[PDB]
């Protein structure tokens, strides 16, 4: 069910995350309190969805992009990263990072849109 | 930033697209006047997309598409519309004829829709 | 921008082909294009290949693949190519070419030509 | 490659000249006509089929679709002398024909 894998590792709990994902969008005083909370929910998914689609990830729930990993970032292996740790304590190892690596997305994502004006077909 | 771009030459601003796309999102008479231009913001925004969907440029900054140039809509030199107009020159130019434009993209992805479902690899 | 070829104008078959094109009006790492053409009577125009400055990769007609290599010299702002086997069959006057290809422009730029005797 | 069908031309000074190209394989409209006076490298008149090369003379036209595509003139200069090529460019092999000739009466 819905955060099941909040304990489980990285790895494992990456194996299910459409169920995190479909559920993100399920008196005069109250009624308009009602009418802020409906409309945050919606300002705040459409803003994820439009950083998807600036780095080129629109669509996907798990999307491979260019650019490198800094060591300086977290220095892990790759192994330890995936199958010893939660997403809950990547979250906190990396917070000072977030960012840094969202505006690298952004700066990759341009160039590639550059080299596709291209057509020598990119070579 | 923001809008600098706006005096660059047409060329020269399509090299800055995002930063154009991340400044669209963010007493009860006050309440409800709010209310009102937070939704109608969203509003907005879902229908250019819905736009891009339906032309065929779903998820991208940059799109090319099947359909051919009109003389009759503008005729200017590519290197005179690329290197010597501003965007808002050019959509001066042109604002006649923005709905037939829209008109015919969506007339062509209906058709390319058509040939995806021959199966002879073939358009 | 202008093409300027030079090598020797005989090679015999045990020597490598080596023709070196200076650049001048641009830099090299900033353009990609950078290309060679053939043309031999036998042949009206073929393409070698070509190589990007700014990334350094290089892309050649797979015909000629086996035996062609493409580089570049920031030093010299120039940029050659190499025959590693050389037969009479491949006499021809080798080109020089810079070709600019975007979705908003079209050009070319040729230099003078060499010819080499094989 | 590509068949030019026109090899030899020769046209009296003030009538146009056409040319034809076949393409093995359809071009997808990225046909490009070269112009090579002799002694001299190959200049570029046309692309995209008939999209007309900065510096080049409003006398050059060309046309076509698919496989099937012409290079044409409204009348022959005796400056207008050379072979001419086509090129295919929607692969990467980029690929010419045999320029055919045109010469003047």
């Known amino acids: 069910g819905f955060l099941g894998a909040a304990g489980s590792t990285m790895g494992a709990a990456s194996m299910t995350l459409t169920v995190q994902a479909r559920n993100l969008l399920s008196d005069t005083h109250w009624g308009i309190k009602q009418l802020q909370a409906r409309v945050l929910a919606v300002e705040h998914y459409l803003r994820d969805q439009q950083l998807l689609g600036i780095w080129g990830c629109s669509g996907k729930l798990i999307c491979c992009t260019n650019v490198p990993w800094n060591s300086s970032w977290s220095n892990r292996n790759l192994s330890e990263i995936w199958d010893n740790m939660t997403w809950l304590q990547w979250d906190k190892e990396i917070s000072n990072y977030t960012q840094i690596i969202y505006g690298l997305l952004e700066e990759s994502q341009n160039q590639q849109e550059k080299n596709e004006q291209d057509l020598l077909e990119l070579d | 930033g923001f809008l600098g771009a706006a005096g660059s030459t047409m060329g020269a601003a399509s090299m800055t697209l995002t930063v154009q796309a991340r400044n669209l999102l963010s007493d009860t008479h006050w309440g409800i006047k709010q209310l009102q231009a937070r939704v109608l913001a969203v509003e907005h925004y879902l229908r250019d997309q819905q736009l891009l969907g339906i032309w065929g440029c779903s998820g991208k900054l940059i799109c090319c598409t099947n359909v051919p140039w009109n003389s009759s809509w503008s005729n200017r030199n590519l290197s005179e519309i690329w290197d010597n107009m501003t965007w808002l020159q050019w959509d001066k130019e042109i604002s006649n004829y923005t709905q037939i434009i829209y008109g015919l993209l969506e007339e062509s992805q209906n058709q390319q829709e058509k040939n995806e479902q021959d199966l002879l690899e073939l358009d | 921008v202008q093409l300027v070829e030079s090598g020797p104008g005989l090679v015999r078959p045990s020597e490598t082909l080596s023709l070196t094109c200076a650049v001048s009006g641009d830099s090299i790492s900033t353009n990609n294009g950078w290309s060679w053409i053939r043309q031999t009577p036998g042949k009206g125009l073929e393409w070698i290949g070509y190589?990007?400055?700014?990334?350094?990769?290089?892309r050649y007609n797979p015909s000629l693949q086996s035996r062609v290599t493409i580089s570049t010299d920031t030093s010299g702002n120039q940029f050659s190519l190499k025959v590693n086997s050389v037969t009479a069959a491949d006499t021809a006057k080798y080109y020089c070419?810079?070709?600019?290809?975007?979705?908003?422009?079209?050009?070319?730029?040729w230099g003078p030509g060499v010819r080499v005797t094989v | 490659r590509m068949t030019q069908s026109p090899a030899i031309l020769s046209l009296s000074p003030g009538e146009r000249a056409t040319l034809s190209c076949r393409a093995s394989?359809?071009?997808?409209?990225?046909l490009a006509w070269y112009q090579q006076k002799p002694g001299q490298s190959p200049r570029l008149l046309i692309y995209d089929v008939s999209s007309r090369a900065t510096g080049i003379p409003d006398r050059f036209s060309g046309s076509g679709s698919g496989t099937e595509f012409t290079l044409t003139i409204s009348s022959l200069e005796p400056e207008d002398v050379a072979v001419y090529f086509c090129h295919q460019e929607n692969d990467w092999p980029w690929t010419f024909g045999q320029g055919t000739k045109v010469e003047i009466k």
């Open positions: 394989q359809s071009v997808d409209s990225r």
């Open positions: 190589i990007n400055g700014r990334s350094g990769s290089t």
């Open positions: 070419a810079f070709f600019w290809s975007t979705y908003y422009k079209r050009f070319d730029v």
